[PDB]
Amino acid sequence: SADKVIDASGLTQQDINDRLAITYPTAVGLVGKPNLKDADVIYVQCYSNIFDGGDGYYRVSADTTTVADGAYVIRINPNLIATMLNTTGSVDVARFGAVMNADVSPFIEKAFKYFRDVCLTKPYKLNTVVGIPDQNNYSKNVYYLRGLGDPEITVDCPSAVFTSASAKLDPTSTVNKFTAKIDVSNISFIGTTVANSVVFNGDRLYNINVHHNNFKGNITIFKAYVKREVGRQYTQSVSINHNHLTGVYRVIESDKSYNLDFSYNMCEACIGGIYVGVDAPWDPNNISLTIHRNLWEGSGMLLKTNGGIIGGTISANYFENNTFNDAGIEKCLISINRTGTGAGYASGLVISGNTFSGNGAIPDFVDVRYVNQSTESSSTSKTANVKPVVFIGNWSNSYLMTNFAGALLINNRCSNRNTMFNAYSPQEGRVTFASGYLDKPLSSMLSGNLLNLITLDTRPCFTAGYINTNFKTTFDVNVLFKTSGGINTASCSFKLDVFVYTPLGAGTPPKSNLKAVMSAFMQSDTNDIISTGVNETMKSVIGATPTMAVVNNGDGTYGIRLSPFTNASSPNWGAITSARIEYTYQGTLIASHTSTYSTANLLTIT
Amino acid sequence: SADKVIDASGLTQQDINDRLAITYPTAVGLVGKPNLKDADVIYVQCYSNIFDGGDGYYRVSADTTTVADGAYVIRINPNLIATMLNTTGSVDVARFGAVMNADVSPFIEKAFKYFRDVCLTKPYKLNTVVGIPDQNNYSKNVYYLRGLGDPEITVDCPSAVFTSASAKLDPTSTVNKFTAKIDVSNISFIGTTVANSVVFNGDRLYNINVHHNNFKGNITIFKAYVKREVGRQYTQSVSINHNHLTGVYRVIESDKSYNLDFSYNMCEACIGGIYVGVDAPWDPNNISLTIHRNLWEGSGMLLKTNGGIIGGTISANYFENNTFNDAGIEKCLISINRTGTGAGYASGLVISGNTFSGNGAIPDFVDVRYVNQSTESSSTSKTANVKPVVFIGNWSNSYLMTNFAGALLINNRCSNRNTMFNAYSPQEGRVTFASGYLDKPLSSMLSGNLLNLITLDTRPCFTAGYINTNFKTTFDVNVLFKTSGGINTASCSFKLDVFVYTPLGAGTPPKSNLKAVMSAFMQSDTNDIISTGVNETMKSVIGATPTMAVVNNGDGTYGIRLSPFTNASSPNWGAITSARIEYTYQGTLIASHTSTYSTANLLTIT
Amino acid sequence: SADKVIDASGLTQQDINDRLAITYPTAVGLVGKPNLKDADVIYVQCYSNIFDGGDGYYRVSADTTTVADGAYVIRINPNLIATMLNTTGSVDVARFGAVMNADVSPFIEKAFKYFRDVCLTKPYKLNTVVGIPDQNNYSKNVYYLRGLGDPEITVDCPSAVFTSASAKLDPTSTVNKFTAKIDVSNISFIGTTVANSVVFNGDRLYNINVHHNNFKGNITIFKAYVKREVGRQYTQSVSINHNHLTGVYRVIESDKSYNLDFSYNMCEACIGGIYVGVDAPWDPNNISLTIHRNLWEGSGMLLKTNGGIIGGTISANYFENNTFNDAGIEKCLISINRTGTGAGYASGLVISGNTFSGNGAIPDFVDVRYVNQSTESSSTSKTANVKPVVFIGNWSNSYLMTNFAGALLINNRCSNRNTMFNAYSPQEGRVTFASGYLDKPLSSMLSGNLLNLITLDTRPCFTAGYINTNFKTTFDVNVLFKTSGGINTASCSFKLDVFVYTPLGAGTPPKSNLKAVMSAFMQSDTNDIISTGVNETMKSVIGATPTMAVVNNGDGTYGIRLSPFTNASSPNWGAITSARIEYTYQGTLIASHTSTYSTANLLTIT
């Protein structure tokens, strides 16, 4: 007996025996084993071979009934089994029989059937299709697949590796055999042949967050296969963010794409990017498309369609030296066309803060080809069924940023801006606009038949820079004259051109000066009716030959006086007592003897 | 004795004994134990029950003095204790006594008191309030709470589960009882009753990054409770990014919100989103608000306020089919109002690249209701105390995108654009603007009393498309005439209307042609003073009836010649020798016989 | 013998012996050891001291030849060694001999030589330079360095801690001694002296994602050192996102920076931010620069340059109370200057949705100083070699947002907007623009010598609000007259001013009314040539004194009738049969008796 025995501690060999664990070499080695009971917890030092790991706890229970898959439940003998206990929360795929440098695909498939978080720590190959437990985009759960150790996964499979459990069974059902809610992280995927390097199935994976991974050589990250939406393939709620990419064949290949994201990636020497609605365009062919904050350098075309893009953001990217593959052929980094049966216009697309450089190798690189987007055949500017791209605060030193005149350009630095038909903003072209109103008792305006309508005051202009105080202004002035009861019995309107000047090159002058010309005088008359019932007309308060004088008030303010004014009265409503004066002006901002602009903003109307 | 014994190795049973570890079943089982000494390191196979895990190392020390909490320090006997050793860096909550499917709340509270990274690997329930060690937003540290295994956490608590250690003690102090710097990740939170499913306390948690989690059923992710800032609740520096969301009752409920982020989430069939300043609006009621790059589909209202939003970005989102709950009632996805005591205007809000679709079910869906934002009562356009939303390159097929005329619209694709009073840009309405200057020795201009002022050159127009070379241009020309010493003794200004035409439908014509009309001629005169001291005036250099001729130079260039010009001289300064010519034009861009625009950009002024 | 012995189980002490693991205390303790064979797998309970951890598996092999580093391979004796087995995938640095509160730098250097994922779980100090295995930005691999337990790392090193293996050897080579592809996460870095707290080397680390960490006290996150690009240092593809920051001395210090990102950080009481091209500016000195969605509060200057920024986004940030350090000196949060040899202009910079508040302490805070950016010396507005910043839907209550008049302002809420020379948009200043065309058989227009050119229709205006139906419109109308064979034999052009008025303050009137004035009439004449060959001219179809009448059609529609019209015919081509009518208008939108705008958008041209 053992208690009789004495360890060199001075301890009973029994009192040792008690502080001791059941440990076996291999998981698969449990089948043999005697001398194990229900409630026994055992520690297996690896699954198969040690260089492959797979270590973890089992629990032995008394089990007659339940069949045994061969990893999660192992039959020790006819009436005893071991079930796998997960400790680390996330589970090595090794624990399921995954072997270093082999096809890990059956093993990932196996593991996900028992667990939701599953992790690779060893180099593997993916040669077969992984199906993934089916759940909808309303599910309680999120399948994770994690990288610890930066596992180097070689991709080599005739299909897209990853699919739904269901669709793996019928890979071709045009029935929506989909799985959602997946997170893939911290893995270096490594490609083989182009044809064999497709990682995810777009037909089949929705709501997938692919983040902080690494892709290398001839990988296609997502492919679509089956025509399933009026003759089109589609993908849905795919997001690729914070990955490195190198040599990548395609970021995504599909007919259509819903809700696709490509953010904060670092992509070197890739072949191609987002090829969507290329062969088979559609009217909406990308519906939400985000390309934010990537590096994409020394590379091919980043985006290529033949169909419409809807609700697109291409922001804060860095694009250096993209003269390769399709980019060198087509001489552009983004190529938006519309051609082929189904193909629609791009609409609602913002392109901002991107850097487009070093495409110098191609003397005629266009950064963003936008072809067949004309809708100049439409007879008005007033509808917005179709709206072209707006580009904003980008920077390009390529030959052209874009070739479509109807692209809206807002403060883009670009070569050959004065080649391009695109509209210049009033801001670039140093033009400003203001508007306001005055309400004025007539009492205060009327002098004989002179209506002292408005004062222009150039003191704010002078104050702020007498040099800058040289500008032309053009005003629309609309006057609504009102009876005491506030009935508009008379109205008139006129353009006014105003020139504000202050002599330069002799030091501070006494003041600024002002001239004005009126034109395009119009007013209400007795043919314009207020009430047919009680027989009431509008009137004409200005007489034969409208006359405007500029009154020089000698300190930098100017009255605009309007002549022959006559009051008219209604039996009902009385005479006019007051006027509402609505002014809208545009001013010249150039002030070419300074560093800055003209004081036109500061011209005051009282 | 043991060395006498012989294992079937041919090894001394003592030489075995030596390569062996102290292992016990349970952590709580250490209390009993004899035959343990100071420096002893022991391996416990689980805390309580095995199905719950909790396994890790202890160290036994000789300890008389220190009291024992019951997990981190366990009393083996009066003079011996075991302290917990953390290996995995992040610590299972199991190791503290957390049990599968129970309230994990005491256990999370316990663990965080000893460790900063704490991790859930087992399904649990949260039924009680977790307080969290108090630290300020200037702290050395970041509390993490991690998900391994996608743990399914059921939320069922009459308060917001997570709070500050302090505020858990007085849940109502209007004193700022806050904790900052928290990271929560990789967990599926699962809701019960609406009333019981609030996860985080906004009053109490600042600087919290909630990322790559999952929320399901009637969760409110954040609630605010106590009025604490002039009658308002507030939250601060909350960020929710890369989560899935499904059935979510509210993303956030509060009076006010500082610095709140909602990025790259995937949200299906949610009830409601960001309800802020709804019951109790305020003037700033959301101060920084980011809603970037989410999926939000088949859902309720995404954002609803009654107070002002300040510094808002709603970008690159995909919004399909949001006709539910409050969205179906109020017939909008975002509902910005101003009403109720305190309520202010929205100001500084950019909404770009969003996709707003399939709200067809409600024939009169408005995407963004913006109600009571009028400030048209203000008498000028010149102040920016209040500034409305700018919408830019979005896409909507809803009945209206918005209902406020003062929203700025830049290249949004939307239905009924010609319903809406919003200003059309000069770019949409095919108008362009340019400006420049010439400096010219008079010597080169003056011929008799003809001032050959400027040349217009339509060769650049013709070169680039003789068809497109049909446009009207309107120029403001300001001329500052200067003495040799560069004193501005004379100035004049005029409008010029220029029509550029090239006959179509007969092949390439010899050239483009040009006509012009001058108007709104004004000039300086002797009443405008340069120096009162030395008695110096401005002059008038153009005589009775200003006359402009267009000179046809026969090759596509045109002189603009100004008539009666007479020099004037100052005793001091001499005659005029040179002029500075400042031009500002606007041109028509429509060119309705082509696909493109008019050559107006390319008209050259020399 | 052992099988003779009997454990209190009733089990043969041999049948125990068999279910048992080889366990030693310490890794370093293996050297002594006898009684171990090839294939033996052993479990070491810590590396050195237990409080430091380091526990993991070795494998014993028979080894004569290979030398032993002292952690990964340990010599047990002349012909036996132990190699380290990695289980957890990511490897504790402890396993390499890292000790609590010491310089972990040699140990990180050691570990990365064997593994790519390496993790800190214990407080340490970084006192020496860590070199990092050299790989290019096209590499199969990504070095990770992880945080578990929120390890508190003190930084205290006379160089930047982290560098390339190569550059650690020659720290000064102007040769491009770089390493790429690194991920650093979940660590609290803690600073000492400013001079000693630099974490990463910009010269040497490319493609580095620094995310979800914590920085505290006098840390400089990145420094550049060596002049290496035409007298400049540079950094490349650095991204700092989702960190906390507190007390941070500099986010980045460099001459130049390529492709730099600063996203979703939470930064409190920092000293300074992105100091780039300060001492030594350059023409492009930041090439791609993203500052998105940070908190930056109670802090110093966030960005400071003296060189050009190219392709910049500063979006959705919250900036409260930034009155400190350099911010209080220079009285600004961003300070973009151009000065010192090499220095260029900022170009292509979008600043949107930021919140700039509580800088009240400095009565004259400018949020974004933009100094020496004038390029008003350029003679046209038409080139875009240089383009200034565009600011859009930000919010500021600082004294000024910016001080450069040439910044483009789009719907920014800001103080003193009517101080600033920046152009007001036509939209703010309540101006709208539309354009279209009509094609019309002359047959339908011509009546005697009256050309009934176009109808204006104010019914759409009235329908939508008879109060708002008071506006001035100014139209450019260009008419291209065409022979049956569609040859443009005649053309004319005119301005038209149109006043649309409807009397207010008496209930719904019968209709809206309309007046118009024509001006700036021009037409083709026989001097304009179609074909010199076959001797063909353009003609004049309007006679002595062009006359336009407004025809009141009595229901809210108005003909514009043009007078003396005469047909002209070509021998070749016949008479004119049809005209193409191109209209471009601008309208006043103010409608100061309502909450909204004028109906000008809805005026219809048929």
Residue numbers in the entry:
A (entry chain A), B (entry chain A), C (entry chain A): 155 to 760
Quote the study's own text:
The capsular polysaccharides (CPSs) surrounding the A. baumannii cells are the primary receptors for bacteriophages encoding specific structural depolymerases that determine the initial step of phage–host interaction. The genomes of Friunaviruses encode only one tailspike depolymerase (TSD) specific to a certain K type or several K types with similar structures or linkages between K units. In the obtained trimeric structures of the TSDs APK09_gp48, APK14_gp49, and APK16_gp47, each chain contains a particle-binding N-terminal domain and a central β-helix domain, as well as a C-terminal domain forming CPS-recognizing/degrading parts. All depolymerases studied were specific glycosidases that cleaved the corresponding CPSs by the hydrolytic mechanism with the production of monomers or/and oligomers (dimers and trimers) of the repeating K units.
The latter domain of APK09_gp48 is about to be perpendicular to the long axis of the central domain, which is in contrast to APK14_gp49, where these domains are almost aligned along the same axis. Finally, rungs 5 and 6 have four strands, B1–B4, with B3 and T3 being faced toward the three-fold symmetry axis. APK09_gp48 crystallographic trimer has a diameter of 65Å and a length of about 140Å. Each subunit of the trimer has an interface area of about 4462Å2 (17% of the total subunit area). The trimer has one cavity in the central β-helix domain. However, the moderate resolution did not allow us to model most of the solvent molecules in the APK09_gp48 structure, including the intra-trimer cavity. The enzymatic activity of TSD BS46_gp47 has been studied earlier. Both APK09_gp48 and BS46_gp47 cleaved A. baumannii B05 CPS by the β1→3 glycosidic linkage between the GlcNAc and GalNAcA residues of the neighboring K units. In our experiments, recombinant TSD APK09_gp48 significantly inhibited A. baumannii-induced death of G. mellonella larvae.
